[PDB]
Amino acid sequence: ELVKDVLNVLIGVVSATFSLPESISSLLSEVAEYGTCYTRLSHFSLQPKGLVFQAFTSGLRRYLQYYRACVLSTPPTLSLLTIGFLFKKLGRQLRYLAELCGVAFPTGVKLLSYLYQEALHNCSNEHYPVLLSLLKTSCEPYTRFIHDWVYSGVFRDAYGEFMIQVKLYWTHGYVVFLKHIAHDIYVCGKTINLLKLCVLMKRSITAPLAAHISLVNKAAVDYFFVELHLEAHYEALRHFLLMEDGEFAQSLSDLLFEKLPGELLNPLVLNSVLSKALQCSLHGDTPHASNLSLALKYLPEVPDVLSCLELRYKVDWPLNIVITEGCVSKYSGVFSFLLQLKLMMWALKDVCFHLKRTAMAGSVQFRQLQLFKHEMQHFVKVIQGYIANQILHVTWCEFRARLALEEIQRAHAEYLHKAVFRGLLTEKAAPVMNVIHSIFSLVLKFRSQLHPNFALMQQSYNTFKYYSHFLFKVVTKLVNRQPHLEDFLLRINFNNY
Amino acid sequence: FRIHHDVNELLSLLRVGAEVYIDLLQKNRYVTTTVSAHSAKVKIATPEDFLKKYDELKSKNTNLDPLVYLLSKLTEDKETLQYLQQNAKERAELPGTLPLASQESAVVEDLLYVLVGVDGRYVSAQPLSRTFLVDPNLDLSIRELVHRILPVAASYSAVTRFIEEKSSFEYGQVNHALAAAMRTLVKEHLILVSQLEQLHRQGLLSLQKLWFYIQPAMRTMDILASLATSVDKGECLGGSTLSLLHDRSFSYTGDSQAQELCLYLTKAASAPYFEVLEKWIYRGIIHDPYSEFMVEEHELRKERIQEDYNDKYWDQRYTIVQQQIPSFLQKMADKILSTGKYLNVVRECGEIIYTLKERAYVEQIEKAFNYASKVLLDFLMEEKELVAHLRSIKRYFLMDQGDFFVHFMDLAEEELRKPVEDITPPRLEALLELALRMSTANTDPFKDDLKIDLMPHDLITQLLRVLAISGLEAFSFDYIVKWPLSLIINRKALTRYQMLFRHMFYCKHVERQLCSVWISNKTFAGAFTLRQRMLNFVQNIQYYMMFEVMEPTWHILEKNLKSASNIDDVLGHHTGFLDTCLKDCMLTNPELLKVFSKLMSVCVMFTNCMQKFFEATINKFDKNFSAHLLDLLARLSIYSTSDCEHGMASVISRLDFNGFYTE
Amino acid sequence: RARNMKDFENQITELKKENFNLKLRIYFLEERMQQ
Amino acid sequence: RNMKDFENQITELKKENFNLKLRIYFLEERMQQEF
Amino acid sequence: REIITLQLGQCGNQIGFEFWKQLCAEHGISPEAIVEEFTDRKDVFFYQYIPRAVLLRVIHSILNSPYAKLYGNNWASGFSQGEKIHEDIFDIIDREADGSDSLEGFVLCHSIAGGTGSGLGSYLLERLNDRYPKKLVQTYSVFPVQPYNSLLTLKRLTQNADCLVVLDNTALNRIATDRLHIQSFSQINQLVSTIMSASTTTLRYPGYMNNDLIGLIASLIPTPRLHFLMTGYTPLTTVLDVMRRLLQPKNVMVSNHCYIAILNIIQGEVDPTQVHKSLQRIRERKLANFIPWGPASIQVALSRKSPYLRVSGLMMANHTSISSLFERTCRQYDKLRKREDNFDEMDTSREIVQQLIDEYHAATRPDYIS
Amino acid sequence: REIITLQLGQCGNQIGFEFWKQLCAEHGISPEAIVEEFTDRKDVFFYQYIPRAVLLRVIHSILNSPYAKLYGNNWASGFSQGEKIHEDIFDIIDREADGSDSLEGFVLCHSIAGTGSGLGSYLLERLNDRYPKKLVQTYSVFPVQPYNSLLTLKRLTQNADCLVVLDNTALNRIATDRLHIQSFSQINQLVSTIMSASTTTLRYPGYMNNDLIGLIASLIPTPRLHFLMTGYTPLTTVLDVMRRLLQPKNVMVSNHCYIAILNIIQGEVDPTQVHKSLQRIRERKLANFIPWGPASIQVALSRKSPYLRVSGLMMANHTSISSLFERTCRQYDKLRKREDNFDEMDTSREIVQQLIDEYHAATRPDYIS
C-alpha cells in the first residue's frame, strides 16, 4: 500500500525503496528530503564545546521527540495525497530548522546573541513559539550564572564561554541584552565579592534583579560610612594634609624654618619634628593622627623660595580602593605650594620682630621702610585669604552635601580636581603662577636684606610694584578667555587700578 | 627556611640579587590555589603526547594544577625556553535459528541477571576494567543497544569489589565510613533490580523501556565507579579522601543531580574525622589509631628547655602534616593547634556536623579557641602569677634593689679579685645568703631561686664574635622556674637577661671603685680635673642606661601584658622587650663596642695607680681618655644621623651639656 | 618614587634587631657543634 | 647623603639577613645528619 | 602661647569680671571652676581650671560673688601709688610669666575716666616696655579734672602699647538708651563683655588664618604710630545682612576720612558660597571709602560658634575719623589751661599728641608716602 | 652600712630632733620606738627602734616630750670646753663606732652663730686625725659673730668634706613672702622638710645612689669646692619643677655658673618625660656651668611613703656662694679696724681669701693649674 514505506522515512529507519504512473517518484523525493534533514539533525545533536550549547542540544532533542510523537499517531493508513498534504505545513518548518543549524557555529554569549537576532528576524511568522522555546531553554546556564552573583557571589567558570573572566584588586576583565544592566551586573559582583573578604521585553530578568542590586549597593555604602568612619578620614585628611588645623600649621612651619645641607634631612630630625608638633596641635593624638609621614623626594645641595618636602597619608586595605594613589599625590602637590605660602608669614613676622627691636631712632628713613613692609604684607595676606576661601571653604561645601560604591570614586576625583583648579596649580594658569613666583623671589630678597643699603631696598620695592601692576594686567586680560578667576581680581583690586 | 635554599641552589644550577627575588614570594604565600585547565591545555597544543599522558595524573590525584599553568607561561616566552634548553644542554654536557520477535524477551531477561552480579546464559563476564560478551551471532541493532546498557554492569562490578576490599582495618576509619556509606546505595539499586524483576513477568519491560529506566541509575553507577577508580588509583586516607570528595562535590555545582549524592557521601564519611576533632579541640586527648589526622606528636623531654638554649619545644611538640589537611579547614589550621597546645599544658596541672555553604563549624572552633585562650591566660595570672615573677627577676638581674647590691660588693670585694678556678662556689653562696638576710630583700617570697654561676668566656669577646660572624667578670646570675612558668621564661630568653647583667655589673663595679678613690686622696694637682670628667662619664652613661632605657621600656611591657589575648602574643612581646633593650644599649654595634671596651679598659687601670702611693703618666692618661672619648663621640654622632636612633642622640646630649668637646 | 622616610626608621630597626637575634642563634649552636 | 646610598644601605642590611639565614639552613641538616 | 590679662580700677575690674563670666559660660566650665560633663582650646586663656587674671573695695564684692573660686583722683597720685607697690605687683607678674611656657601678649582692661587705673596703667605700660621688649602688649581702653587725666595717659599709650581698642561712652549709652531703654553700669558693660569674647573668636578656636594675636594686629596697623582700632557688633539673615549692617554710624562706637584695612569675623554656620557675592555688592554700591595711595582691600574670616551657648558678626577697623575725638580733648585742654613742680612733661604730652593728630590728617592726602 | 647622727648646740639639737619627728611620722613607727602595723630600707637611720643620735638646756625641754622613750658665747670658750670634755664626749663616740656594722658617714647639725660653734670646730679637727677614712657631713646653720663665723668657717672649709648653708636671712624671706609669719618655731619647719628630703634616696631603695658616698663625688669635684645649696618648689610636670628650682628667688641664697646639680623628683611621674625635660631646658638655656671642664646635670626619681602631689629638691654647688663669704670678709675687716697671740684669725683670713680666689677663678677658661 506504500503507506508504511512513506511513514517509515521520517522516523529514520531505511526501507526497501529508501536506501542510504511515473510522477510518483517526484512525490517520494519531496518526502525523502523531509526526512534527510531530520536524520542530519539527529546525527548533529546526538551528544548530550560549551554549557550553552549543551542546553540548546537538549532543547533540540526535546523538540525532536515531540515531532516523533506527532508522527505515527494519527494516521493508521491514508491516501498518498493525504499524507503529502498533511506533512506540508510542517516539513518546511523542519527544513528551516536544518538551515538554522549547520546541517561554523558560535558558542557562549555569541550564540545567545545570534539566536536573539534570529527571533526578531521572523517574529511575526509561525516560528516564534519554536524559537522562543529554544531560547528559553538555551539561556538556562546563563540565568544560573546571573543568579550566582546576586545571591552567593562565588564566581563560576566552565570553559570561559562568557564574555567575562578572572592593592588595586580590580583586575577582573569585562569585555543583545539591554546595556543598562550589563555594567551594573559587572560592578555588582565586585561589590559583593569585596564585602565577602571584610514584542521582546526582558522584564522577567530585571524584575527580581533591580531590587536586590539596589539593596546590596545601599548596604555597601552604609557600611563604609557607619562602621568604617570614612567621613572621619576626610575631615581628618583636610585637617592635616590641607594644613587647615591651627596650632599645627604654625608649629610645623615654625620648627622647620627655625634652622635655616647635611642637617634637616636625616631621619632623626624630620621624623621627630612631626612627633613634637602633634602635641602642640591639640587636635589629634588619635589613631587618625597616626600614619602621617614626612617623605622626601629630592635632596638639594644648598634667597631661594623652594624647599621640597612631601606629606603622604597612609590607609589600610578596606579603604585603599576608595582613596586612589594619584589623589594622595596631588594632596602633596597642593600641600607643597601651601607650605610655601606659609613661608612668608614666618619670614614676614620675623622681620616685623626684627624691626621692633630697633626702637629715639625715629626719622624719615625708618618710617619709609616700614610702610614698604605693610605694602609687602597686604599683598601676601590678600591672596592667602583667596586661597583659603577657594580651597578650604567653598570647595568643601561641595562633597559634604554631595555625598548625602562608584559614586564615591567619581565624586572624590571631582572634589580634588576642583580644589586644584581653584588653587591656580593648573597648567592653564601658568602665567599667573610665573608672575607670582617673581613676587615670591622679590619678597625673599627683601628678607635677605635684614641704613647701609636703603637704595637696594627702594629698588626692590619699585620692582615689586611694577610686577604687581603686571599681575593685575595679565589677570584682567585672562577674564575674556574661568569663573573661579573672576573672584581673584576683586580680591587683588579694590578702590584702585 | 627552605625557600632561601631553593633560590641559592637555582642560582648555582643556572648562570647569572637573590634578596629581591625571594621578596616576590614571601609576600605571596597551607592554602592551595587553582586555575583554569582548558585554556592552558589548548595553549600548549608533538603536542599530542601531552594530551593523552595528562589524564593519568589527575586520575592519581596528584600540586598538579599550578605547575600546568606555569608551563603555559613558559611556552609564551620563547626566550625562557631557549635559555632553559641552553642551561639543560650545558649541564648534560541459538538466536540465529530463533524468531527475532521472541528473542527480545530472552535478551532483556538475561540482561536482568548480570546487574545482580551473576553470569548470564548469553551475557557473561570475561575474567580479568571489566568487559562482557553478549552473543557470537545476534542482530546488529540488538547487540548495539545492549552494549549501550552494558557499562552499568561493569560499574556494579567495580563498586562491589571496592566495598569488599576497603573493609580492612589497615586503611583508617574514614575509609570504613566511606565504604559503609555506599552500602545502602547498592542495596537500593538491587531493590530496583528486584522490582524490575517482578515487573518483567508482565512483559511490560522492553529493551527500550529498560534503557530509559536505567538512565537515573546510569549516572548513579557512573559517579560511584569514578569515585571508586579515583580512590583506588591513588592511595587516599585520612583527610586526603575527604579532600577528594569535597573537590568532586564542588566540581558538580552546576548539575543539581550529582551534587546531592556527593554531599551525602561526604557528610556520612566525615563522622570519623569530625568525631576525633571534637576531643582534640575541647580536650587535649588524641586517640590517633592510624596516621590520618593533621596533628602529630613528637616525644621530647620537658626539662630540655631549662637545660639548654637550642632545642625548640613550643614549635616541636605538635606540628601539621600537610598531606592530611581536609582542604576545607586550612584557614583555621593554626588556631586548632593553639587550642590543643593551650589545653594540653593546663590539663596536666589542674558537636560538629558537616555542612555545605555554611561556616557553622568555623564559628564554633573560633569561640572554642577564645575560651581555651582565655582559660590559659587567667590560669597563669591568678595563680602562679606572671607579673610578680617578672618584678622579681627585675629586682636582681636588673639591679632594681640597690640596697641588696651595695652590701654585696662591699662584702665580697676581696674574694672576687682572685683569679678564676680559685674560688669555690659554696663560699660565694654563703655570702649571698648572709647579704640577702641582712639587706631589705627578706620581703621576697621567691628569694630562693638565685644561684651563682661562672661563665667560661668574657662578655666583650663573646659579643665581638657573635657580631663579627678571667677574674671578677666571670661572675653571673641564674634563675630557676617551674614548668608551667618556664614555657615563656626559658633559656632562649633568659640568656639575654644575664648578658645584660654582665655589662650592668661591670659598669656598676668600676664606678664603685672609682668613687672610692675620691675618698682615698681626700685630704698631685692635675688628677682632680681628670677625675671630674672621668666620673661624669660613667654616671652619665649609667643614668642613660637606667632611667631612659630600663624604665620606659618596662612600663610599656607592664601596660602591654594587661591586654593579652593568647600566650603566643605574650612570648612575642617578651622577646620584643628584651631585643629592643639590647638595641638601646651600647651593645649590638661592633665599631661602637670596641672603642667603648677600650675606653673601659682605660677606666679600670687608671684607678689602680692611685693606691700605689708619676707626673709623666697623668698627662698620658689624660691624652688617652680625651682621644678615646672624642672618637667615641664621633661614632655615635655619625650613627645617630645616618641611622635613626633616639638613644644615641640622648647620650650625646647627656654626656656634654656645656658645648665642650666641640671638635 | 620616593620612600615614606618614616617606615624607613621602623623598617631599618626591625631588620637590625632581627639580625642580632639571628646572629645570637648561630653562635650558641656552633659552639654545640664544637662541644 | 646621595638619595642612592639609601638603596645601597638597605640592600646591604638585607644581604646580612639573607646570607646569614642561608648558613642556618645548611647547618641545621648537619645536626640532623650528625645524629 | 599663653595670654595673660590685667584689670585696673573699678571700671576695669567690673568689665573684667563680666568678661570672665561670659567666657567661662561660653565653655563647659561651671562657676566653681569645675568642668562639667555637658575641639575648643581653653589652654590659651586657662591654666591647669584657673584664669590667668590679675586684679588691682570692689574686690571684696567680687569675692562675695559666686565666681570666687575662679581666681586718690589725680594722675600724680596714681603714679605715686604704683611706685610704692611696683615691686609687690611685679612679683606676681614675673612668677606668672615664668609659670607660663611662652607668653605672647598682655591684655589690659583699664579706664582713663579720671580714675587711678589711668595712673597705674601709665606706669605698668612704662615698665612692661622696659622689662619685656619682645612681649606684645594690648589694652582695651575706655573713654568718658576729667580732661586732664584723659590726655596725660595718651602720652604713654602712643609710645608703649602696640595696639589700642577704644570704647567711648558717648556711643555705648546711645545704643543702650535706644535698643535697651535703660532710662546702669552692669547694663552697659554686658554689651562690652560680649564684644570682648567675640573679639578673640579666631584665637580660642583653631583656624587656618590668624592663629595668634600678632597675626591679626599686624594687618590693621600700617605704622606703629597709627595703632588705633574700633569695634562693632551688629547682633543686638545672610552674609549680606551682616556686612551691610556693620557700616552705619549707628553701630560704630566712635563719637576727608577713609578706612585703611577691614577684618571682619563671622561666627555663624552661614554658607561660604555667598561670601564673594556680598563682597561684590559692597564694592558696586560703594558703602565704604578706602585709601587712594596704596591698594587696600577687605578681609573676612569664618569660625565656629560654641555649641554650648543665629549668625554673629564683629568688625575691627581703623578710621581717620578717630581724629575728631582727639581734637575735642585738645580743645578742652586749651580751654582748661587758662582757667586753672615745673610742668614740663605735661607740655610734651600736648606736643606728642599734636604730632599724632598731624599724622592722622596727613594720611588722607594722596601723597602720604615720602 | 650605718650612719650615726650628731647634734650640737641649741639650734643643732632642735633641727635634729625636729627632723626625727618628721622621719618617725613618715615611717610606720610609733613615737615610743615601737613598730606600728597600720618595703622601705630602714637600717640606715634605725637600729633594731633606737635612733643613732648622740644628744649633747634644750635637752631638758626634749625629755618631757612624748618622744622621750625614743632615745659660752665665745669661740675660744667653746674650744676650751671641747678640749676639757675631750674624754667625756669621745667615750660615747668610740662605744658606738665599734657596735656599727660598717661606718660610712657622720651627720653634724649645728649653728655657727656659741657653745656649738666652738664644739663643732674642735670636733672636726679630732675626727679627721682619729678617723681619716670616714666621711663627715655638716649641716651648718648661718645667722662677736664675725670672728666666730670665720673661725668656724676655717675648720669647716678644710676639715668637713661637705657643708650645706642655711641662713636665717633667706629663711625669713620665704617665711614672709610665701607664709606671712609677721618665729623660730616656723622657719625650722621648712628646714625639716629639706632635711627629710635631703637623704630620701638613701632611706628609700632606688636604682642609683643607694649609698651616701656616691652622692658627694658626683657633686663635689675637689675638696676645696664642697658647698651644696638647697631648693624646694612646692610651698604640674617635671618641666615646671625644673624651671622653678632654677628661679633665683627659690634658692636658699641671700661671671657665675654651676658645677654639678642634683635633682630629686619625688613625684610619681612616668619615666618618659624625664629625658625631654632635660632636652627642653638645654634648648632654652636656663642656666650655665663651668666652661673649663665638662659639667653635667642629673635627676633622680623616688616614691612617697604610702602611710603619709609632686615635690622636688635641688643640690646646687655654684661659685655665687663667694658673695656670702665676701660679706663675712667685709664685716671682719670693719670689725678689725674698729676693734694669746691673736694670729689664728690672721690664718683664717688668708685661707678664706684663697677660697674666694679659688671660687672666683673657677669660672675662668683656664682654671686648671
Next chain:
Amino acid sequence: LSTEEMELYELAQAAGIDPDVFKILVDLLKLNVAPLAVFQMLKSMCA
C-alpha cells in the same frame, strides 16, 4: 629524583628543562608558592 618528581618530569618533556632545576620548581610549588610569582622569579632571573 623521586618517582612523583620524575612522574611530573615526563609530562614537562612531553609538552616541550633541567631535572635538578625541575625538582626545585616542584619543591617551591609544594610549599604553597603561587605559580605566577615563580614565573616572575624566572623572568627576572633568566633575562
